[PDB]
Design a protein around this ligand. Structure first.
Ligand SMILES: [Cl-]
Ligand SMILES: [Mn+2]
Ligand SMILES: [Mn+2]
Lengths: 174, 171
């Protein structure tokens, strides 16, 4: 019963800045779904769940006032550090960012990236672009599968089943 | 904006009872997310959204776990009951009943619940199931969405069209 005592709502509030935005899906729902996936797999860690609610807020909001994170509570500093670990710097090679997370990322960053990827892989279900589904499937297999194998075998199984399912859709349709 | 002052985590705790079955836990949290997305910042509704399928999907569920949380737990329980189908009840007549007698909040909650379920059809293949679910959504939930929230109607519309388009372009 440790989850009852985690004050998440202020991090949800911050995440509402994303309401009205799409990345190939709905960025706000994606933050809350990422948190749901972490709780689903039994990660009840204050900093990780809090970071999960705003992990894309720095990346996807122009001129985002980082003090909106840092002013919330005594953990806001550890939350900010975790969000930074999974924020891609402007212009940085996506390949090298993912490679960098597996090499130097904390346990929590790796877990967060896996949950982020599960949520994004589920959102491919409503896409049609076809070439996008394939590139995203390949990226997930090459770079995220190994992260999931380090931190959580069950997360690896879900990522596996989602990649197989989407590749199967390409082959039976687009 | 009033979101900071809403005591949500204890209702999330309750929702973790659903971890294990079909994904019902994710569905509760996604339903709450959809409500926040559409700008519903109402204590009772967001709280109900986190546990709306707990009574429906857990046989011998100790309702006191809900009623002991806070001063609103009674209003939350009543809202959950409005969108709970009784053990033997015609699905048709339950949906008809929600549009006839359901509160504004029950109707909104059902729309958000349906949006979330319609998004989860994206990983299904059963084909006959997709069609029945699409038809059920068009006939019984579209009109609910038209009463309470036009934007929710547009999302339910686009999801039904998207899934029907999939059926037509393969099996
Ligand atoms: Cl909370
Ligand atoms: Mn993300
Ligand atoms: Mn439901």
């Amino acid at each position: 019963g440790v989850l009852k005592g985690i004050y998440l709502a202020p991090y949800m509030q911050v995440a509402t800045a994303l309401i009205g935005k799409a990345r190939h899906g709905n960025m706000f729902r994606h933050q809350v779904d990422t948190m749901a996936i972490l709780i689903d797999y039994g990660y009840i860690d204050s900093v990780l769940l809090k970071a999960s609610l705003i992990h894309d807020v720095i990346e996807n909001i122009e001129d985002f006032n980082v003090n909106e994170i840092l002013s919330i509570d005594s953990e806001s500093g550890q939350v900010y550090e975790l969000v930074l670990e999974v924020t891609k710097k402007k212009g940085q090679e996506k390949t090298e960012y993912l490679k960098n997370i597996i090499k130097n990322g904390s346990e929590k960053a790796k877990i967060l990236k896996c949950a982020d990827r599960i949520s994004n892989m589920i959102s491919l279900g409503f896409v049609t672009d076809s070439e996008f589904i394939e590139r995203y499937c390949n990226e997930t297999e090459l770079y995220i599968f190994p992260i999931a194998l380090e931190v959580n075998f069950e997360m690896y199984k879900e990522l596996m089943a989602l990649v197989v399912s989407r590749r199967q859709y390409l082959v039976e349709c687009g």
